[PDB]
Amino acid sequence: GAMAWPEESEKRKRVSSAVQFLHDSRVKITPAANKIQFLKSKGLTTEEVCEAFEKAGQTIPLDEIKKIMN
User: Hey, is 61 helix, strand or coil?
Assistant: First the structure.
């Protein structure tokens, strides 16, 4: 890919942890702001958050994620 394997492995783990989070019924019932602020607290970037929503089948437009991230 574009990054070296150590950095890739860390990113992939953050994103996969976020996907697992977003699938859980306890999380699904809450609004995007709650779950995005939570993922922000775990160190995810705006783009990692977006990728997690995509991979969870819950796509949010990146511009809307950016606005909630702050």
Answer: coil
| Structure-block tokens of residue 7 | 């950095």
| Vertex 10 angle, CA 53 and 40, to 5° | 45
Q: How many residues does the chain have?
A: 70
Residues with Cβ within 8 Å of residue 69, at least 6 apart in sequence: 36, 40, 46, 49
Instruction: Give the residue carrying structure tokens 């997690």.
Output: 52
- Residues 18 and 49 sit within 8 Å (Cβ to Cβ): yes
This entry's atomic model was obtained through X-ray
Please, what is the end-to-end C-alpha distance for the chain in angstroms? 29
* Contact predicate 65/46, CB 8 Å: yes
